[PDB]
Amino acid sequence: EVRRILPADIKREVLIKDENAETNPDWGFPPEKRPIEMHIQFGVINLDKPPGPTSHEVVAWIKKILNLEKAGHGGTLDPKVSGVLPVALEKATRVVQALLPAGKEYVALMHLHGDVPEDKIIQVMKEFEGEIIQRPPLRSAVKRRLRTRKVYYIEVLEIEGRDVLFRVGVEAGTYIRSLIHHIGLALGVGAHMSELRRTRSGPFKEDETLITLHDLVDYYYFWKEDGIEEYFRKAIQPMEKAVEHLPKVWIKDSAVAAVTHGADLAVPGIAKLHAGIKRGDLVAIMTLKDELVALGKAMMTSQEMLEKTKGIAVDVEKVFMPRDWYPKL
């Protein structure tokens, strides 16, 4: 509990509504049960975007290379920017809804226009931690009103000449470029962002799952030409990964069948859920086997979902799970 780390790092408590709910082993397709074909249908790539193309351009390349019909990315990265670019595929394409508003982390290089003592650089940068005022750019919105945004943390890494390398964690909508420009004004001499790379976007970060377009295509070829599935399979994360940072509600089988058949999530359909859910919050609706069923907006707080006997706990906005997994109404 503190604006000092990325919210995705904060663990939530699991409240239990119904302790005896059980799940049928015959129903559903947990990640470790999905054939490669199906894994792709409900997959998300943790792509290391290269500097150069626009993110849209990158998605287009991927749609072509993998012969896909649908794909989408979870957080626009400017052309010169590299880094984590989650790319959801086919039936999972809309899970980006859960990523676009997630917290982000970057490693940025600021170029000062004058000589300033290190201590003053560190001092002034520590001032930009927390809720700050940052008006949107000239490109976004038709109402350039100044709003606030959270900078979860700013950590200066190295200082060479007038070049300042630093790591920064922020809530969606925070422009690193503006942040650095403002720091320049605060220091008087001025500054601009010379380089930028994203190291975290929601639950996606720089780990073994981060893969480049070169690796992607090659692993693809290994699967298509040599019949090797292991590499391409690992290059694709199951959609469930794209929802790891979201508060969840685990529902009974009958509730899963109801939701995958157009109904909303009923309060009595909840077996257990995360605490801290507030009305209006985006929540991941999960199966008792941890499969993603849908994304929705919370109609009540965790405490209400926990104690209530009836009504709608969550308004379903998008269903990912096919109707044949968990059959009947």
Binding site: P50, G52, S82, L165, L213, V217, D226
Partner: protein, 52 residues
Amino acid sequence: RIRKCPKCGRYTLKEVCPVCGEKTKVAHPPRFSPEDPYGEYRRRWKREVLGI
């Protein structure tokens, strides 16, 4: 130019990592073109290393 060390992934501007002394590399991945020239060559050695 932003760099990072292959081991311990520390980010730095220095050629050699201040933490482990091992050499660092530009953090950005190589440029990509859908035409992917040399893709065949790359896969030839890659199949070898992986054992495909």
